[PDB]
């Protein structure tokens, strides 16, 4: 299907504004709308979004309303302002992927035959990216239920347009990884990556709590992947692998050695260049 | 003589003392010699019969080695003494080096970016 | 059954457990590999068969508890390596 879905900052912001605009109830309620955007070379881009009215009682989650006329009427407005953008999917806060959001996609399947739903939290206090993009994929089997239809995840990242980036960076003026070198990498990928790995691993452990207190009767497939995960663990570091590592870890140190030595020489010449400067100035002065 | 391995001279000097018998000290050296000699022979050598080690230093056929073997290793066999040394299972590992190396490189990063 | 560390099934150790002669186990391993059901290589010098990936199967309720152990022993290892960088790299952060 689609390899990845890029979400522009404007759409991200128009969803936070939507929740606060209607979230006067306070306790809890999702918010659902319709996404707009365009894609090229099998890579989706989402730029604009508008709010579609949507209500649903909590009990017996098979009741909900989405205004088709509002979707059709408003899209006539957005089409006039910008013709390039056409409906591509829908969004909803829905932190936990509520169950009823598998027949809703059928409602929006009319306007976009291959639509994607992006769940974007409005109240994020976490470390991961707050944009999960799912696509509908169909396959019926004899294990789950006679009617089988499940979402498949597509990697999503926050994009940036030339005009939006100007505003986005102006709006922050709060913190930036200035001098983006060894300092940002040691923190933007190494430490953060470990944090994510732990959380995902902890997520797996939480599900495995079913061993004692069964929640679902062994999903079967989840176990299959977990078995493959363990086999894929790098082979014990005791064989010829250890020699290969040293022959490469040390090989990288020579370049570091050479780079440092060149750095010292240039640093020493720089001090000489400056030191002779003030000595010459002082000598002439007195 | 003790600094190097030359020991046949030590017993030769043990019988030549300038002041007096000095035996109050030579007895002390016995502890510092036999323990060292046994340690050296402890390497990964092959069998050594109870004929060289017996008549080597000063004694002809005593029972001291029997006690000596008892407190040391030198498993008793068919006149067969073994001294096996592998020191191979412990080496060839980088997981423990991994923690040491990680600290090392970070210091390079530490002393390359932040102002001292 | 074998832990991933050893996985050095010898030719004799396979024939005995399947009731084959030693001079025939070779066609068995290839048959398994041809279908795509196990993965590995065959070394007919020391008479060894390497295995690297046996197709996953079902684990009723006890081998899954053991799977929990391998995640606890692994999450705690990754946890330690996180604070190690965070503590010795305090200056390089934020």
UniProtKB/Swiss-Prot annotation, chain A:
**Which keywords accompany this UniProt record?**
Acetylation, Isopeptide bond, Proteasome, Ubl conjugation
Q: Name one GO cellular component term.
A: extracellular region
Superkingdom field = Eukaryota
Which GO terms are recorded in the biological process aspect for this UniProt protein?
Answer: proteasome-mediated ubiquitin-dependent protein catabolic process
Domain MPN, residue spans? 5-140
Q: Where is this cross-link: Glycyl lysine isopeptide (Lys-Gly) (interchain with G-Cter in ubiquitin)?
A: 176
N6-acetyllysine-modified residues are 200, 210
Per its UniProt record, what InterPro entries does this chain match?
A: EIF3F/CSN6-like_C, JAMM/MPN+_dom, MPN, MPN_RPN7_8
Listed GO MF terms: protein homodimerization activity
What does this gene product do?
A: Component of the 26S proteasome, a multiprotein complex involved in the ATP-dependent degradation of ubiquitinated proteins. This complex plays a key role in the maintenance of protein homeostasis by removing misfolded or damaged proteins, which could impair cellular functions, and by removing proteins whose functions are no longer required. Therefore, the proteasome participates in numerous cellular processes, including cell cycle progression, apoptosis, or DNA damage repair.
Question: What else does the entry mention about this protein?
Answer: Does not bind a metal ion.
Quaternary form? Component of the 19S proteasome regulatory particle complex. The 26S proteasome consists of a 20S core particle (CP) and two 19S regulatory subunits (RP). The regulatory particle is made of a lid composed of 9 subunits including PSMD7, a base containing 6 ATPases and few additional components. Within the complex, PSMD7 interacts with subunit PSMD4 through their respective MPN domain. Interacts with TRIM5.
What the record says about family reads: Belongs to the peptidase M67A family.
Name by which UniProt lists this protein:
26S proteasome non-ATPase regulatory subunit 7
Task: Write the lineage as a comma-separated list.
Answer: Eukaryota, Metazoa, Chordata, Craniata, Vertebrata
* Gene symbol of the encoding locus: PSMD7
Curated annotation (Swiss-Prot), chain B:
Q: Where is this cross-link: Glycyl lysine isopeptide (Lys-Gly) (interchain with G-Cter in SUMO2)?
A: 63
| Its biological purpose | Component of the 26S proteasome, a multiprotein complex involved in the ATP-dependent degradation of ubiquitinated proteins. This complex plays a key role in the maintenance of protein homeostasis by removing misfolded or damaged proteins, which could impair cellular functions, and by removing proteins whose functions are no longer required. Therefore, the proteasome participates in numerous cellular processes, including cell cycle progression, apoptosis, or DNA damage repair.
Family to which the UniProt record says this protein belongs = Belongs to the proteasome subunit S14 family.
Q: What assembly does the database describe for this protein?
A: Component of the 19S proteasome regulatory particle complex. The 26S proteasome consists of a 20S core particle (CP) and two 19S regulatory subunits (RP). The regulatory particle is made of a lid composed of 9 subunits including PSMD8, a base containing 6 ATPases and few additional components. Interacts with DDI2. Interacts with TASOR.
This chain belongs to which protein, by name?
A: 26S proteasome non-ATPase regulatory subunit 8
Q: Which gene encodes it?
A: PSMD8
Full protein stretch here: 235 to 350 of 350
Curated annotation (Swiss-Prot), chain C:
Which residues does the record list as N6-acetyllysine (modified residue)? 16
**Record function comment:** Component of the 26S proteasome, a multiprotein complex involved in the ATP-dependent degradation of ubiquitinated proteins. This complex plays a key role in the maintenance of protein homeostasis by removing misfolded or damaged proteins, which could impair cellular functions, and by removing proteins whose functions are no longer required. Therefore, the proteasome participates in numerous cellular processes, including cell cycle progression, apoptosis, or DNA damage repair.
Q: Could you describe the subunit structure of this protein?
A: Component of the 19S proteasome regulatory particle complex. The 26S proteasome consists of a 20S core particle (CP) and two 19S regulatory subunits (RP). The regulatory particle is made of a lid composed of 9 subunits including PSMD13, a base containing 6 ATPases and few additional components.
Of which family is this protein a member? Belongs to the proteasome subunit S11 family.
Designated name of the protein: 26S proteasome non-ATPase regulatory subunit 13
Organism field: Homo sapiens (Human)
Which portion of the complete protein is shown here? 283 to 376 of 376
